[PDB]
Amino acid sequence: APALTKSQTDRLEVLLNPKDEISGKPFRELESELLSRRKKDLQQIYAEERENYLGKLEREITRFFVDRGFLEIKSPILIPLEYIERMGIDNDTELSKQIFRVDKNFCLRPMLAPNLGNYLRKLDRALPDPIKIFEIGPCYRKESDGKEHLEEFTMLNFCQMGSGCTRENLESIITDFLNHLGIDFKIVGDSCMVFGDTLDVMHGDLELSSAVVGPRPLDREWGIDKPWIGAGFGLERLLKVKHDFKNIKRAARSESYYNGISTNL
Amino acid sequence: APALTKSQTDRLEVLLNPKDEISGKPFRELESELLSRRKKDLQQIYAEERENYLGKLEREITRFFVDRGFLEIKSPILIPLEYIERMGIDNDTELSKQIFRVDKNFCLRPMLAPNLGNYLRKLDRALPDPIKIFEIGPCYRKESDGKEHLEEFTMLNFCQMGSGCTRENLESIITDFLNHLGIDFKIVGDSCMVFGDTLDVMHGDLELSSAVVGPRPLDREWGIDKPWIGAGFGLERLLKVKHDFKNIKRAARSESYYNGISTNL
Ligand SMILES: Nc1ncnc2c1ncn2[C@@H]1O[C@H](COP(=O)(O)OP(=O)(O)NP(=O)(O)O)[C@@H](O)[C@H]1O
Ligand SMILES: Nc1ncnc2c1ncn2[C@@H]1O[C@H](COP(=O)(O)OP(=O)(O)NP(=O)(O)O)[C@@H](O)[C@H]1O
Ligand SMILES: [Mg+2]
Ligand SMILES: [Mg+2]
Ligand SMILES: [Mg+2]
Ligand SMILES: [Mg+2]
């Protein structure tokens, strides 16, 4: 009955899944049981559904927003560095240090707002009020934390421009959206140096989203001058909460986890 | 009846769609008709389907491969630069000049094979023969051309490892796949300095895919030592052929086109 070492405990925690029936037994026997369960999990997925959780959640979210009147956007991932400055991200500011630069000209987008802003302006010349669009896709930020942050993550951003752009409607859409996914939340006032007063959608201490009721003074910089509402959510945070993963690495695009199951068996 | 200038003709060609009923009339009246048609196209999309073509094609392809027994993978977009060297991409070779480097350590993947190779090895410890997986996602290459090449594009890669890994089965899957999408093709032998003998799937002069029947000597470098087959396809090329777009910029993740309709109206 010698106690487990910390490294042994870390190995088992890699193989552990939240719903597992979790002492006395030696490491090798516990590792062997969990290896066996996890192989069985992968087999069941391969035999039956075959869908990746992140891809699937993206499809479910897409269905939700298309059915509620929002146009699906697929915009570039590499964007001009200008777009960041025009977002008023001064080089002093924390999010400046977080940008992945690629060329002299471009970066990997740290957020979806810049492209959606351009779509709102452009679509305003063609579509009837209100204009409703959303995008889901990769975003990139350099981060220090690893429990709730990834450097490569997936963001949903939805927005509406014209009539109906109230706090009430925004909260109502957020509420329907998270009640549809079956994720608990509360809405709290917060701020940030780019957008002023946000609503943050929180699960305990974890920020699922930052949302905003416009207008804001930077709007003019995108040729926007109508009311608008918008919110951005992290898909990997949503998965982490929905599947009760202890670490966000389980929800990521990854070579070490598949639907939260270690691939190192 | 003065002739159209080349710049005027370029403006109209931006607004023209392949199915349009295409003289005599002045520029302003032709531009106005086409503006009107294109606004109507966007309105119809917004009123009815609301789906982006590239997102939609990704869903349809996903359905096709999941239904035929392939596991859906979502792996990282930023990958180690090592992975490129281990692919045997010597710095001399053309694809070396095409890599978008990000850090000292990482690049934007120019292809999906490296990650899929790792999944095949890892999954072999858990799944029954044959192992079938696919991934669809962003890939990046610096290119000179702009008619058939983008720097940011979307790749499908499917592969099978173990039994059933023959040329015949690979051609059969390619055939079913493209007959399901309704895209004409022929299969031609070609080569490349990384994989030896490929099959290239061609539409006229346009390469839709490069596919390979293994094994190959580099396999060992990924811990793979079984037969395998695989192919990689460009979604934007598939869309370009399917919708008969003259330029691949119409099929891309973009701020200038939405489902091949100019957004500059
Ligand atoms: N590094 C990251 N990894 C995973 N998800 C993220 C990351 N950054 C942002 N998100 C998600 O994207 C949503 C909107 O982005 P944003 O509000 O700008 O992030 P944020 O306010 O910096 N949150 P945090 O960094 O946790 O304090 C957040 O609510 C998160 O759910
Ligand atoms: N720059 C690009 N833009 C769009 N699609 C691409 C690009 N590069 C590759 N593809 C697609 O990805 C598939 C597999 O990649 P690969 O065969 O390595 O490209 P390739 O052989 O360099 N083709 P090409 O560059 O046109 O001669 C190709 O058949 C194309 O359909
Ligand atoms: Mg942050
Ligand atoms: Mg926030
Ligand atoms: Mg090429
Ligand atoms: Mg090729």
From Swiss-Prot, chains A, B:
Location within or outside the cell: Cytoplasm
Keyword Ligase part of the UniProt annotation: yes
Covalent S-S links between cysteines: none
Keyword Repressor attributed: no
Function: Catalyzes the attachment of pyrrolysine to tRNA(Pyl). Pyrrolysine is a lysine derivative encoded by the termination codon UAG.
Family as reported in the entry's similarity comment: Belongs to the class-II aminoacyl-tRNA synthetase family.
Protein name: Pyrrolysine--tRNA ligase
UniProt source species: Methanosarcina mazei (strain ATCC BAA-159 / DSM 3647 / Goe1 / Go1 / JCM 11833 / OCM 88)
Gene name linked to the record: pylS
Included stretch of the parent chain: 187 to 454 of 454
